[PDB]
Amino acid sequence: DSIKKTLFVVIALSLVCSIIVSAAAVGLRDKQKENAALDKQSKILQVAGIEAKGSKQIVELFNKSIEPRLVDFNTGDFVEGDAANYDQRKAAKEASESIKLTAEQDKAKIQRRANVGVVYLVKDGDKTSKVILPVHGNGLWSMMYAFVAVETDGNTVSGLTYYEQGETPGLGGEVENPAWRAQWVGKKLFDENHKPAIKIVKGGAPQGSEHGVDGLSGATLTSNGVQNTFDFWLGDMGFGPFLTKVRDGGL
Amino acid sequence: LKKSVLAPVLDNNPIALQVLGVCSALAVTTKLETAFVMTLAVMFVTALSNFFVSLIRNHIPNSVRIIVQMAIIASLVIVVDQILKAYLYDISKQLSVFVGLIITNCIVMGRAEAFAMKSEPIPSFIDGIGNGLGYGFVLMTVGFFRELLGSGKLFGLEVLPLISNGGWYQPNGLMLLAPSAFFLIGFMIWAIRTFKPEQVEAKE
Amino acid sequence: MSTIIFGVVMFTLIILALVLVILFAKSKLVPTGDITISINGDPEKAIVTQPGGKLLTALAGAGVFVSSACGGGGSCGQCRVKIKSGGGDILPTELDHISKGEAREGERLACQVAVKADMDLELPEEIFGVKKWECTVISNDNKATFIKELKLAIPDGESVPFRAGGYIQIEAPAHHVKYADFDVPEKYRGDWDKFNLFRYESKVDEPIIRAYSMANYPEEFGIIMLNVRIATPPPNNPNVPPGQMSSYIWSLKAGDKCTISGPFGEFFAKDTDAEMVFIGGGAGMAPMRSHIFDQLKRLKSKRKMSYWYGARSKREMFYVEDFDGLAAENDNFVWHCALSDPQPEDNWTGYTGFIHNVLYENYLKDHEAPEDCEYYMCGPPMMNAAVINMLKNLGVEEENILLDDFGG
Amino acid sequence: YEAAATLFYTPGLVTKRSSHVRDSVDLKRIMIMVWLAVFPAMFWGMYNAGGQAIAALNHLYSGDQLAAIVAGNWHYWLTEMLGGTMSSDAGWGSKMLLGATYFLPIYATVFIVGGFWEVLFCMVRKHEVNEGFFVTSILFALIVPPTLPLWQAALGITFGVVVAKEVFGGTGRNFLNPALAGRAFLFFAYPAQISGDLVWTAADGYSGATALSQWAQGGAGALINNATGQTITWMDAFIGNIPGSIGEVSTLALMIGAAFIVYMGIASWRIIGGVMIGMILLSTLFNVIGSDTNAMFNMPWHWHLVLGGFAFGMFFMATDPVSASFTNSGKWAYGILIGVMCVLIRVVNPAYPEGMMLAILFANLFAPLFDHVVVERNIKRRLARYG
Amino acid sequence: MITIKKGLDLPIAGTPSQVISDGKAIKKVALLGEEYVGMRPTMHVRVGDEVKKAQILFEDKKNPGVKFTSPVSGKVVEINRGAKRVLQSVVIEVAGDDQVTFDKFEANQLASLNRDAIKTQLVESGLWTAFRTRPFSKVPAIDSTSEAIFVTAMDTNPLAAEPTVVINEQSEAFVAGLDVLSALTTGKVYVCKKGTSLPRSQQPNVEEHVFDGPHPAGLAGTHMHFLYPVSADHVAWSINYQDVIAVGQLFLTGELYTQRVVSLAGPVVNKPRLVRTVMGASLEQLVDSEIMPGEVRIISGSVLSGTKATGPHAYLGRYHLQVSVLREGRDKELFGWAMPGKNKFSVTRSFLGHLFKGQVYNMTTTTNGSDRSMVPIGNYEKVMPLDMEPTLLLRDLCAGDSDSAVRLGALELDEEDLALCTFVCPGKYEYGQLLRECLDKIEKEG
Amino acid sequence: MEHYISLLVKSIFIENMALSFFLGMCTFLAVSKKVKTSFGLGIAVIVVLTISVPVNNLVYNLVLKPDALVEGVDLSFLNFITFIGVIAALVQILEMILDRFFPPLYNALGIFLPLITVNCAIFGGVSFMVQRDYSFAESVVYGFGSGVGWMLAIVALAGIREKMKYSDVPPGLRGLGITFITAGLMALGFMSFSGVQL
């Protein structure tokens, strides 16, 4: 009869399609995760200043030189956990691990804080030479993410890279310009009193300045976004305690 | 044989004579690489969906054949999405929703219903390939102009030295925004209907 | 491994979604009883289905499925079906696929309308209505250098029922034919040799069926008369294939069997006391003869009649004697002919030029009321265009001119 | 020749049907009246463009530094050659000339490039060349900064004339504002040249914000003319002593020009009234609500009026007969929507300091819908058999 | 009472002096064939035939039973036909006084006559063609009935005659015509007039209404829009005061009454005044020696809705009650479009002429400008008093959207109603043609 | 419902469902011939989006999200099948046949849902709700803001095209070409908002 035949044919089609789909999905999951890990590690190495081309090269160099770690923002001290596979964005999104910021503290307009951060130590030999701090904040059109590599004295920036901005190309997207990113090398994050001193100077910073950086031409709103990002994260509410610990030495 | 595959390219174009398959066609054309990958994905999905639907139209239950064909299309699209995420991650990241939206693409459903339900498997497969080529023609010809004039690149290769690199060309901003796709499609249709008057619409 | 759950979840989701559609959300407030769809107003061929689904599914079950391209939804609107019962829901997207009058009088798109209440509708059926006669050819000879007459007997003694101005449908098993395979009298040899048509040939093997008018009129019994013109490649491009069926009829012999079908036609005259005018030329002579005979001999109508014929030369008009006899037996009829290609040896040039020019200059130029009479025509397309343009310029209304698509 | 016989003279024709007597007005007179109405704004814009440039130059440079600068730019050394001076004490004539050497090239390029497309379309379609291009070109030339590149101006006018107007059949057929369409093309294609601090004053090496870019930062306390160190006042804003687009600055001049075309019955007073109503209502609502952070919330309506392109757009470009609503009832709603959108984009959207162009382009999409809403009520009233 | 705010009193010079004087002798009259909407004639006469007064000349194929009759006794001298042999006019040369005669009645009996008797008398006498129908402005079919008949006892066209002066000469005839219409009406008879007094009928069916304002106030279309809105299901009949006088005279004396009183006026008329002429008179003979030298245009009717009277059409139309003459402006003027017109008329305020109130213009037939697309600066709303969207209606008409013109109200209009909209168009469109073309399309379906 | 209106404004204006993401064009450019049909079609799309987006959010969070059924198991690859099936079911019956109460409502917008059951706009809205880590805290803000934008855009285009009967577009550009140009201009107009400063 009809109903039995239609049920049978639907049964068969569903079984075949489900088997194929499940096999394909489960087979490739590890390779997809590997691709994502490679995508992150490439940017981390590029910020660290280690030359690397190819999947094998990236993997071997990241395993050899980098050491992810977890940091508790409240006390700026390390904690134990799965640092390599941590997901700070998801931690911020969730309600248990993360907190709501207040309008007084939310300088960068991020509106939530993960409460446990991940930082990457760059190692040559047994010692440590740099620490790479992921920072992010709101620009004009979208949320902007970047890595800042600071030397082991806790004051001198070794490099900066914006890897997800989404601003307007050519006007606000110049944060990704190599000529602009090259200005950060050698600048000092803190003054003699140990407070934030990075300033995005509108109209260009004075030549030879130890704290100023040229602002983006015609993109003062994105410059303000960057300034707010660094004001929040360099402050005592963000990475300030951990940076004081780093400056104390023994990293 | 080859007439079936080649005619939809310009005689019965999916987007230039009918208005099927524009949703992703106009959203994934800021990069020629993404346009090309989307064209290949649509070819794959349409061809195999038509083949499988044709293989079973004799026993398909007339009452609910829509669900059967939609399930086949969705399974094929899921497999395609997994493969792209596994082997072309850099491109799959850029497509985002539009790889999934192939399920609701009008071309795949229309060819399945109209031709595969009443045609032999190999002819249906060839028809799917031809319709995919017709779709890809518009995709690539929009992407070429948009990429070239908005970033001076083709497939990511530098062609026009930009001012930011010490060159002489200043990229156009509109080509990276939606309205440029509308304008390019409209003028493409104008040129096609000028060089092939048989497709002009009547005033009444 | 552990993919049994991955498969199971998809399976159960699909089956739940399907059974939900089949079960209809646990409660329907429609009648839920069996409902009846009626066709053409009689019990037979009706369909009974429970409420739910489009009317197109009931129509498909009835076997009269209608075009529903693009999945319906009013995309192009070919799903129109006449509905005879009371009024109901008509969607706003249907109100432009039909005229403003049709928007109210029961015309609706079946692919969109749904089986929700007892319904009555109308659609054509058994359109073929075919009955045929196994007719046998009697004789065949050339009336003009490009036209031949054909006589064929009819079984059961009587002529196939037909109306003046109609057409019959003729069938024949075709084969390859060469123009040297049939001959012409000497009076047409004079140009058959000059054009050397004997070298032409055509290749066909499939059956052929076509509609053709008759030259006879209903009062003739047991015989149908018609004339055919040869489809020869144009002199400006002889490479065009010759006409397979025209060559077939021109080459086949007497005693051959061809079956007449569909003798009804779709164009006819009507009973109006107004004066009537006829113009003809070439192959168009047969319908004009049919009408003239049906009105003057069978009907013996009192209305005024006249007829002009457009020939190329003396080599292209035929059986003027029948029209002379018609004019002799009745004084309310007249006959004329004109030469569009007069030849010196014809030694008679009573009328020359195109048919429309002679018609206007001799009759209508001084006529009392051109608009108070009806016109019938046939012939080459350019003669037809000239005639209709001339009549419209003379001011005759559209409805009074009657045009046949085949031209002749 | 043909060019003169079609422009200067009247065709010398007669009526062949219906009304044997005709009104004296015509499209040519309407368009020429509109074209003449912006002359005060044009001249004051040239004067202001020269004055601001001279002030900024004399603020930044002096002596041989100024001499090297003037010798390096053709505007400056042509002004010097033609008798004008770049000194701090330059008279009104030198400022007018320096503004002319910026405005005139832009106007000529716009006119020639747009006329090329106009003539091409009219010739190919066998039409007669129309007259509205005279208004289109001058408005487009007046609503752009003094420092636009000529190739950008040509691209903008090409887009505006072709895509927005000629594609639909010419004058009276389009549904969108051509000048605003071209300005928006430039706005979204090349933002760096039509926004920021670097483009609104034509002094080389000078960088300074403008009135609305300063209020959004610091309120009325931040309104300061950096070139001279004085504070911008409401009278300065009203008269037109502030930087900005060439012709937008002078609210007094724009009012003087628009009064004539409003009195003459060419510009609809209903649209202007609706714009004013919407602007006043929304601005006063924002003032009442207030805000701790957004400084734009406290700008009053009489400050909204004089800053930016509000006056120019309202008077001369919100009244385009073809784009606006065709019903008297719908015109009020059209103007109200334009004003509301302008104030809303000014106050709430942080990316742009002004919103007149976008507001007008948005209201052009919905004017036909207001027309439909009105006409449907009229049709229902008719079916009631009281109309 | 009812006040029309929007409109335009055209200030053209040469206003007639409202005094009636006997006109010049007329030797030829004609029946114009193109002024009757949608009629196909069937000629009952041929050149050379002797015809009496009220003798049938032809009848309409599409309106069975309607008969058009001669206005004078004489001989058929010409029959003019244009393109596609469309009838242009049938000319009769006056001679003798033979006439067809009908029944008589006393003034007391008219209000009680049978509708069939009235209709047969009117159709036989040929006066049945005075009636027109809204919509479609056609002559009503004989077997049809209407519930509202509109009598137009006011005239506001430029240089128009004063209806009171004419009516006061024929008070009894006017009253008798009103009484007959009261029996014909099957409903009410509306006598639309100005604020002055007129002869009055005692029947309750007849109602007097008062309209005030500029020109549009005098049109039967406006009267219907305000008193009895028309549609496909409600059709009203329109007649004018002189035709009412003719009806009264017919039913009083049994013989057709064909006299008329028409204003002869215009910029180029030496002595504007009212002239007593015959119906269908030859304008070429009426205007003889009445005009200044030069090239002029003679119009049958007002300058807003008249017909150019040249050659075969040089005869007074049946529905027209005035003759207008004005010069032909063929000259070209240097920079004429830019002059500060102190003597140029316009409904806008871009000319100096509007400042001089009371000024009167010697207008010509020029088209000030050339054809252009519509740019709606909003002139139409100044001159349309009706409750419609004029710009949308006119754009629909121009686009050929007949199905939407009916929605917007095209069924209520006539070519005379859009005269001012045509007048004030910056694009120099002619909207009567478009309205008639759309109305034909609407009528030729059903 | 209210989480923050800067999300609604952005989705209405800059990332508009129709004029920016090209979602639903195959019927947006076809049904826009007349205003009366487009109005009801847009209202139906509004309601369908508003109801479907939160429902699919809940289903994804409860079943298809990684874990959420049993630890260490992720069914997220069934997203497409589940979303399409749920969209089909939640309309094809649960409105098409469900709307028996309010007959004047059913004959008003219930006649348009059979066309939207497989429209790409619905699936794109759900896919966006998933691709961006939204929540039932948003619940309806995103879906409602997207549906209202789609309805507004289609109604505006229908009005423009009705007003466009007076145009004289070139023969080769008649129809699809001029419709595409009009849509591009409409998007250009719609690009006027991106956020809100409270």
Ligand SMILES: Cc1cc2nc3c(=O)[nH]c(=O)nc-3n(C[C@H](O)[C@H](O)[C@H](O)COP(=O)(O)OP(=O)(O)OC[C@H]3O[C@@H](n4cnc5c(N)ncnc54)[C@H](O)[C@@H]3O)c2cc1C
């Ligand atoms: C209602 C009706 C009545 C008819 N009455 C008659 C009648 O009374 N007498 C009569 O003789 N025929 C009549 N015909 C047939 C008509 O004349 C056809 O045009 C003719 O039959 C076509 O030639 P064919 O059938 O031999 O060739 P087909 O099998 O139709 O093949 C086409 C052939 O015709 C030739 N051909 C086709 N089109 C043209 C053209 N435009 N110019 C020149 N050559 C062309 C080609 O070269 C080719 O050889 C009638 C048809 C209809 C439908």
Ligand SMILES: Cc1cc2nc3c(=O)[nH]c(=O)nc-3n(C[C@H](O)[C@H](O)[C@H](O)COP(=O)(O)O)c2cc1C
């Ligand atoms: C289309 C467009 C896009 C813009 N995009 C950006 C942007 O992404 N980032 C930015 O900082 N400014 C951008 N701007 C410029 C700002 O609107 C604003 O003018 C600028 O931040 C002011 O800089 P200033 O303070 O130096 O004058 C854009 C302008 C336009 C017209």
Ligand SMILES: Cc1cc2nc3c(=O)[nH]c(=O)nc-3n(C[C@H](O)[C@H](O)[C@H](O)COP(=O)(O)O)c2cc1C
């Ligand atoms: C008609 C018109 C419309 C304008 N529209 C905009 C606009 O939409 N966005 C914008 O940023 N500037 C626009 N401007 C430019 C501003 O008016 C102004 O010149 C510029 O933003 C300089 O800053 P200010 O407005 O603070 O003076 C427009 C100008 C005119 C004349």
Ligand SMILES: Cc1cc2nc3c(=O)[nH]c(=O)nc-3n(C[C@H](O)[C@H](O)[C@H](O)CO)c2cc1C
């Ligand atoms: C009062 C008035 C204002 C006008 N404003 C504009 C305008 O702002 N931009 C423009 O391109 N054309 C303008 N025009 C010209 C014309 O109306 C416009 O091009 C139309 O859109 C026809 O194409 C204007 C015309 C008038 C009479």
Ligand code: FES
């Ligand atoms: S692809 Fe056709 S509606 Fe989205």
Ligand code: FES
């Ligand atoms: S075929 Fe598409 S609605 Fe009928």
Ligand SMILES: [Ca+2]
């Ligand atoms: Ca976050």
